[PDB]
Amino acid sequence: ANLWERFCNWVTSTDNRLYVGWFGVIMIPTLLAATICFVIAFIAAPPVDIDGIREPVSGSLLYGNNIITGAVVPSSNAIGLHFYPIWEAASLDEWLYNGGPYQLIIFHFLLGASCYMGRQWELSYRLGMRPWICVAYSAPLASAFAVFLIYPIGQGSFSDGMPLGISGTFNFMIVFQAEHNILMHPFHQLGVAGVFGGALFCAMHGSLVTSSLIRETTETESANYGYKFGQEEETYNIVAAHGYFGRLIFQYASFNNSRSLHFFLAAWPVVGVWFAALGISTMAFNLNGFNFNHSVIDAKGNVINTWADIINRANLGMEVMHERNAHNFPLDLA
Amino acid sequence: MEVNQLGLIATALFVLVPSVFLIILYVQTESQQK
């Protein structure tokens, strides 16, 4: 074999401890760049003028943050959607002031994570598996796209991208609520059903399989030793688990087909999270949550508040206080 | 910054005490007969 052939054989090899693959050829460098920049920035980056108003926000540990307050801060509103690579700055000091690390990190990450998804397809193919794990990963991936790319596009700035940090994340959430009433949007509601339900069904599946494990061990050892990696025989009694669950509710509400069960376990969280992602991606173009502000009126025309109006008061609080020096005109239009 | 001056020792022991516990249990497992 020639060099290219040998190289291709290595890249696509099923015997590498970690699969590389063609997706991996892009994933590995982009993820390493994003990671290294993030780590250094999170530790040592100076303050960043997120809102383009010469009001720099400190995100790094060395500049007075802890793990909870810290962040890599979004690029400046002055930049908007412009591409701000290192080489468009006059110096690294300028690059840093303007939030250049954010763009480098999110662009390398989104490319790398997209290739992580491709790589899941690729290895499934090399190993003779069915191909759709990558489709389940499209749900968190789409969500990362929504908050780091689609929302900025809609609003016209990477300054409105989710910050890379814990408190930064909460800031993004509170301002999103003020601006889009996300809680009242059915796609975020589906998202909640997706993750609360994913958690519920996770606990339920775990508990039911654990309930029905076949006795293979004694009281002074972990029941886990009753299963051996690669054994042919199933390790729990699905008939007993179904016998249980079908009586807990009623018979036809319980799955007696493992394939159907495991498909439901995939589909419920994945579909819900796809709607979560689509919620963010469509509120990106300001189709917002349901607005029932003053929807209930009495015979005279007096407003009779509902819980929607109370939400509205909270939202107003968020709206009027956020980015307190950035607005000069009465309406926040993006 | 004016941090709590017991945060360092609190954090160090929070890590070290249970980590030590686990390392002791692991190593004595390995040294048992195969």
Partner: peptide, 30 residues
């Protein structure tokens, strides 16, 4: 001291990832 402590914990986590991956108990079939 605070910064050192955060970075130290993170770096221990990263080392752990390395050992958990490359120095795992290998899975063995029966």
């Amino acid at each position: 001291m605070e910064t050192i402590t955060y970075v130290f914990i993170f770096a221990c986590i990263i080392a752990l990832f390395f050992f958990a991956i490359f120095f795992r108990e290998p899975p063995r079939i029966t």
